[model samples]
Target: MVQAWYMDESTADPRKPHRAQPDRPVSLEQLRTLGVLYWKLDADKYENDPELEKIRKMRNYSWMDIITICKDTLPNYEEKIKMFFEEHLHLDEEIRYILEGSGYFDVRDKEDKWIRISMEKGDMITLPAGIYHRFTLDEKNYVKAMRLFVGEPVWTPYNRPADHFDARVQYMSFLEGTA
Candidate 1:
């Protein structure tokens, strides 16, 4: 299962759970309002998972690749990790299926407060295109994830202060029931 909560104001370590005092948790329904989607699938049997297959077909996810992020496997690990933590948005949805280990995906709420979503093995999440968000590995410092794409993958990140893009404008409208 996945977990989400309001993050504390901490600069100690990016991987720490930084849970705010009183532990304000965010629910899946709340996440949905931001156009974020999530699912729990059998990570070990994903190769032949009917539900995953159906979702892939329904969403037209035709391309995918596995990535292991850690100091050992990922080249330029420190730099890449830093880059991943930068608030940014893409022109297309960001879909990731966690195969092993864990990580955090922080997304901006309607009021712009950061909601930290904890993802572990068997968890899959999708951030709608144009959502301001970022990702980072947990304290364990490793995560193996399946990156899914509708067709060819688009890895471009338009850093924050990019509200002028059509995708960002449309995403805002979507939240207001105008898109």
Candidate 2:
């Protein structure tokens, strides 16, 4: 069922790669080489979200807003962290770099076993189309990563239909389970 709108003949990967350099210089030639088609954010003049004023103040964040995962340990571990399998994903694949801290990305069933990509500072991760994935923060209370995404309103967070993270586990956690 792999259908498509148009095919690109270029040998280069369509995915974009970004560096940690703030206000990085991007030119047409460089973009073409990376198969880049647009500039999502400049990492400069990031507008503040009024609703998150308290979060901003509490974090004492002064850096310009780049699309980041706000890598932080999920509190209330005893409580369940939900996992869902969303059918579709944001149109433009996200491109980002790990500037600090560490975490894990759990990709469902596509693997024979859980593939935990644990990464630390200076690492980079790219999420391709509809790749079922979720992240788990390490012992570090927080992690910071730079992000570069298409300059458009990305769709709402994509998640599996399951109720929690372990729901997608290869084996059953309870009697009612069926993979």
Highest TM-score model number: 1
Q: State the number of backbone clashes in model 1.
A: 0
For residues 1-179, what per-residue lDDT tens digits would candidate 1 score against the true structure?
57999999987888899999989999999999999999999999877899899889999999999999979879898888888999999999999999999999999998899999999999999999999999998989889999999899989998898899999999998899621
Error of 2 at 29 (Å): 27
Superposed model 1: Cα runs more than 4 Å off? none
Which residue pairs show backbone clashes in model 2?
Answer: 83-164, 84-159, 84-160, 84-161, 85-159, 85-160, 85-161, 86-159
CA lDDT of every candidate: 0.92, 0.37
lDDT of 2 by residue, 24-96 (tens): 3333332232222222222222234343333335433333234333424445432322321223233334444
Task: Identify the candidate with maximal lDDT.
Answer: 1
lDDT of model number 2? 0.37
Question: Each prediction's TM-score against the native?
Answer: 0.96, 0.41
